[PDB]
């Protein structure tokens, strides 16, 4: 099993940045994919940012030129980068990491807690 750490939420100005981390712990073996989801009252929830092993990443139209996610493989951490952030980027920011020991396993998928981020004057 593995244990996602996330740090670096809270309150933040209109046109503010913010650094989220998500540290992973445990038996971890092949990372095939970290991301970052967020959950927002009446926004359901979306994929924010992802990695593919191989480097390959995705973001969300809304966030695409302002966020910027990045990790250390050495360190199995996932951060996200936020920049120019706006009050429709308030929400719970969850990362997700799927590992598995073998091509021939499903992969399993372990969640971070969630951080609120709120963006208001």
């Known amino acids: 099993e593995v244990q996602l750490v996330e740090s670096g939420g809270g309150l933040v100005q209109p046109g503010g940045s913010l650094r989220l981390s998500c540290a992973a712990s445990?038996?971890?073996?092949?990372?095939?994919?970290m991301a970052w989801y967020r959950q927002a009252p009446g926004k359901g929830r979306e994929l924010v940012a992802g990695?593919?092993?191989?480097?390959?990443?995705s973001y969300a139209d809304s966030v695409k030129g302002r966020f910027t996610i990045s990790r250390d493989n050495a360190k199995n951490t996932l951060y996200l980068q936020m920049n120019s952030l706006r009050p429709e980027d308030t929400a719970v920011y969850y990362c997700?990491?799927?590992?598995?020991?073998?091509?021939?396993?499903?992969?399993?998928?372990?969640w971070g807690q969630g951080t609120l981020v709120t963006v208001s004057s």
């Open positions: 445990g038996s971890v073996f092949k990372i095939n994919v």
């Open positions: 990695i593919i092993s191989g480097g390959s990443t």
């Open positions: 997700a990491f799927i590992t598995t020991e073998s091509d021939y396993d499903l992969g399993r998928r372990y």
